[PDB]
Amino acid sequence: WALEDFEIGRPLGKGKFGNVYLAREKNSKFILALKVLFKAQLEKAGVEHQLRREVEIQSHLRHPNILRLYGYFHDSTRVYLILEYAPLGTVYRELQKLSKFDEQRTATYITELANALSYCHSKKVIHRDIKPENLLLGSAGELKIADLCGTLDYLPPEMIEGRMHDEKVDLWSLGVLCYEFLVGKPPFEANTYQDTYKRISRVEFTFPDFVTEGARDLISRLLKHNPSQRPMLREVLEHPWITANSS
Numbered sequence: 001w002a003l004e005d006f007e008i009g010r011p012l013g014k015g016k017f018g019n020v021y022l023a024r025e026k027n028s029k030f031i032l033a034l035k036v037l038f039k040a041q042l043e044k045a046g047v048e049h050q051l052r053r054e055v056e057i058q059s060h061l062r063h064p065n066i067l068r069l070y071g072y073f074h075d076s077t078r079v080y081l082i083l084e085y086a087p088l089g090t091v092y093r094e095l096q097k098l099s100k101f102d103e104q105r106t107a108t109y110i111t112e113l114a115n116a117l118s119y120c121h122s123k124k125v126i127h128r129d130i131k132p133e134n135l136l137l138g139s140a141g142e143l144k145i146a147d148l149c150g151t152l153d154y155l156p157p158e159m160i161e162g163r164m165h166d167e168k169v170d171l172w173s174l175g176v177l178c179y180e181f182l183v184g185k186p187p188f189e190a191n192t193y194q195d196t197y198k199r200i201s202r203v204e205f206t207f208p209d210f211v212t213e214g215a216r217d218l219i220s221r222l223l224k225h226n227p228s229q230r231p232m233l234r235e236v237l238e239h240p241w242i243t244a245n246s247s
């Protein structure tokens, strides 16, 4: 496998370490996403080992709601990842267009993620980053997972406090996402870092008017301070509000 076996098209996204391009395999005309990473930049951050780790993991994961890694190769100055192309773009963009999602769309997305994360947890893969910009949309509008300054909200209390940490972190993330989907902003975001940390640490947030009793119930359960009191992914799937609203 090599670069000349691919027709490179338009860029789809610009990361720190490198770009991702829309492309077709020359022989078959199989549409795909080609992620290019510059080796020198990877070596400057000291993440070449964490990159090899993601790649090993993603290649062994096959779920319809996890972005598939078909392969990889490298030349002198670059690393190439042959990836599934999600034709409909990022959830981030969808959310910026619609402002917030209704309950049917949200429950359906959360269902897809609960399944995605169950698969992961079952393969001892934990903490997959599920903030909107890391969620793509496949051919059927189905969502796909694809894993200081950032959004602290998504980090659970036990991680920001450097306590012991579990699979239960994905449940917290899921509750944050569910809120962001319905409301259009995440629940703990503040004017400063200190205020955000405080809000997370104490789970201080409020619901806007329009959020229904069922949505509040689910989000409240996912955003429990004690990781042990957070529900299981199965209990999320079987939640009245999810089953009532999901496709």
Ligand SMILES: CCN1C(=O)C(C)(C)c2cc3[nH]c4c(c3cc21)CCCc1c(C)n[nH]c1-4
Residues within 6 Å of the ligand: 011, 012, 013, 020, 033, 067, 083, 084, 085, 086, 087, 088, 089, 090, 136, 146
């Ligand atoms: C530039 C905005 N945009 C669009 O208008 C459409 C809908 C064409 C679109 C599809 C897309 N797919 C994917 C991306 C993307 C972006 C956009 C972002 C890069 C990561 C990636 C991977 C790893 N796979 N697919 C995708």
